[PDB]
Amino acid sequence: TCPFYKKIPGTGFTVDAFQYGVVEGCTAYFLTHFHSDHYAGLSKHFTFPVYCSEITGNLLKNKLHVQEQYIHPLPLDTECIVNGVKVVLLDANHCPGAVMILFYLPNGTVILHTGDFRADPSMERSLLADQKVHMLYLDTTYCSPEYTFPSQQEVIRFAINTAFEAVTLNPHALVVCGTYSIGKEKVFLAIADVLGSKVGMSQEKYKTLQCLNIPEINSLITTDMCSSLVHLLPMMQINFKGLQSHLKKCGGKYNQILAFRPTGWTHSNKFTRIADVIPQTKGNISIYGIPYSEHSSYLEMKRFVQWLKPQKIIPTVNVGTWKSRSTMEKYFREWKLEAGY
Ligand code: NI
């Protein structure tokens, strides 16, 4: 049944709750972003109001064929009324179109639902600065101190410098980047920019990108693989067998592959700096795992929460085991005692 952490008290609202059938007493279904674990259940057959960003609403219409009359896009950073309740959508610094939602309850309670987010000090100057938030529904993906990772900017610098050096040393090398969802577009776009290439991809993935309101996108991507030396493939194909296979398909235009897998966290983070990352190599194929995250590190999460000073935290991630739930609750209490709220 729908878990309590997807329901907003004092309203008829749910968040990211599309896979439970008709949720009893739900008048409006919010969707924070277009990732499958969150939209699971939506289709052209859905006939309740979906509230979301503009970009999310483009993907719902074009990719899932949801009917236009049930898509209610809202502008960001704008006080809006939904079924008699004031709400605001804020940028979540996750994937394109991802939002956090502020709910102003009739009784005076203020609730923030982060959806999925990568906390940033820039959030401390949004409309969140303007009033007190009583309850926080928190993306706790990486809520443990072992989870460190570099800035997105440091990771993109490493990727651009590695790609540029490789292709300048061997003008017959092909670059390949993995993907399985929207998000992390900077990785393949930054690499294509330094190389003076468009990124080549499947018609399905091209259609997905054309929904994202990214400026000048027609100048950066293409479905003509032959004209491109940065290719995007399913993340599943980013292995020596899949890459050898792909190389055959390019008809001797290329004699080497340099591939990137933009992972979340992986344990070499606990030891190794970005400067010191090395690839796995077999013959003329090299694969780099790069820690490009669109979720908060432990320290980023901690800073946001100690800034906001909520009265109550409701985790939305890692809630399935008692050991995770108890570990998370211990961190929340530490943060509260350290900061004095
Ligand atoms: Ni997500």
Side-chain angles (χ1 to χ4, degrees), residues 1-23 25-203 205-215 217-240 242-247 249-269 271-281 283-311 313-341:
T1 68
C2 184
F4 72 99
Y5 66 83
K6 296 187 180 277
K7 292 166 169 189
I8 304 302
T11 70
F13 303 156
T14 60
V15 179
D16 301 346
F18 295 90
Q19 66 163 298
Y20 306 99
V22 183
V23 171
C26 183
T27 64
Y29 289 81
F30 286 77
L31 177 60
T32 61
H33 66 292
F34 198 76
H35 283 166
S36 57
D37 279 0
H38 302 259
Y39 63 74
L42 277 168
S43 74
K44 75 175 72 168
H45 305 297
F46 199 82
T47 53
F48 299 99
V50 179
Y51 286 86
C52 58
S53 67
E54 181 184 346
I55 284 162
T56 296
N58 299 341
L59 292 156
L60 286 179
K61 180 193 172 183
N62 291 287
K63 300 294 297 188
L64 298 181
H65 308 289
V66 172
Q67 291 174 49
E68 190 140 69
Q69 76 181 124
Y70 308 110
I71 309 172
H72 302 260
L74 313 174
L76 295 194
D77 302 314
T78 300
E79 295 182 326
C80 296
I81 307 311
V82 173
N83 298 357
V85 175
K86 182 160 67 164
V87 308
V88 173
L89 305 188
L90 307 168
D91 203 280
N93 188 38
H94 184 53
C95 68
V99 301
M100 312 193 286
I101 313 160
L102 263 183
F103 302 93
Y104 292 77
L105 267 42
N107 77 2
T109 303
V110 174
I111 297 168
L112 178 62
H113 195 303
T114 66
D116 284 346
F117 87 142
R118 183 163 186 179
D120 193 72
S122 65
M123 296 172 172
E124 303 167 15
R125 301 167 272 282
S126 60
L127 302 196
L128 286 176
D130 302 37
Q131 80 296 280
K132 189 186 176 52
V133 171
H134 302 87
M135 304 183 75
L136 178 59
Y137 285 66
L138 182 62
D139 170 17
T140 46
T141 296
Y142 296 124
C143 190
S144 192
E146 66 272 32
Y147 297 116
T148 62
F149 32 63
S151 70
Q152 290 178 167
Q153 188 269 335
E154 290 171 73
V155 173
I156 288 306
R157 181 101 294 218
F158 173 83
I160 285 161
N161 291 353
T162 304
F164 182 75
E165 175 176 312
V167 174
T168 297
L169 295 167
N170 181 188
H172 302 279
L174 174 65
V175 178
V176 178
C177 292
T179 185
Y180 41 32
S181 51
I182 69 170
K184 303 183 188 188
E185 290 79 10
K186 194 70 172 172
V187 178
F188 52 88
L189 302 173
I191 294 166
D193 176 77
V194 82
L195 299 174
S197 187
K198 292 192 188 183
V199 185
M201 63 194 73
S202 75
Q203 295 180 250
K205 182 79 189 179
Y206 185 88
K207 170 185 190 179
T208 299
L209 301 186
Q210 282 294 166
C211 302
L212 307 182
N213 293 354
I214 286 170
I217 193 64
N218 298 334
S219 70
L220 320 168
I221 61 171
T222 186
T223 60
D224 183 358
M225 311 291 286
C226 293
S227 61
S228 169
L229 63 141
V230 181
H231 298 171
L232 301 194
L233 297 179
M235 195 78 78
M236 287 193 68
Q237 202 167 354
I238 314 296
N239 49 71
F240 296 114
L243 292 167
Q244 279 160 195
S245 181
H246 183 68
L247 189 57
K249 281 165 255 178
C250 296
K253 206 157 199 304
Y254 306 111
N255 63 358
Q256 172 184 13
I257 282 168
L258 185 123
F260 298 88
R261 298 195 327 90
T263 55
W265 172 89
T266 68
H267 191 56
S268 20
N269 269 299
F271 307 118
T272 319
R273 286 158 140 69
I274 192 64
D276 320 337
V277 164
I278 64 172
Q280 284 200 218
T281 297
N284 64 339
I285 302 175
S286 287
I287 303 171
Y288 285 91
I290 57 171
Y292 192 92
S293 178
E294 293 185 335
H295 296 273
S296 309
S297 70
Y298 172 84
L299 294 168
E300 292 166 347
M301 190 189 299
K302 176 175 181 284
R303 177 188 169 135
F304 179 80
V305 175
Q306 289 183 312
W307 175 79
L308 191 70
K309 304 179 171 64
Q311 294 176 5
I313 306 179
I314 303 178
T316 66
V317 191
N318 303 314
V319 296
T321 83
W322 297 115
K323 182 173 159 230
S324 303
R325 286 198 158 282
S326 173
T327 304
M328 294 183 294
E329 290 180 15
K330 287 177 30 266
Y331 291 127
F332 304 148
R333 191 53 59 173
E334 294 176 13
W335 299 352
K336 177 179 170 86
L337 287 168
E338 183 184 30
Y341 55 96

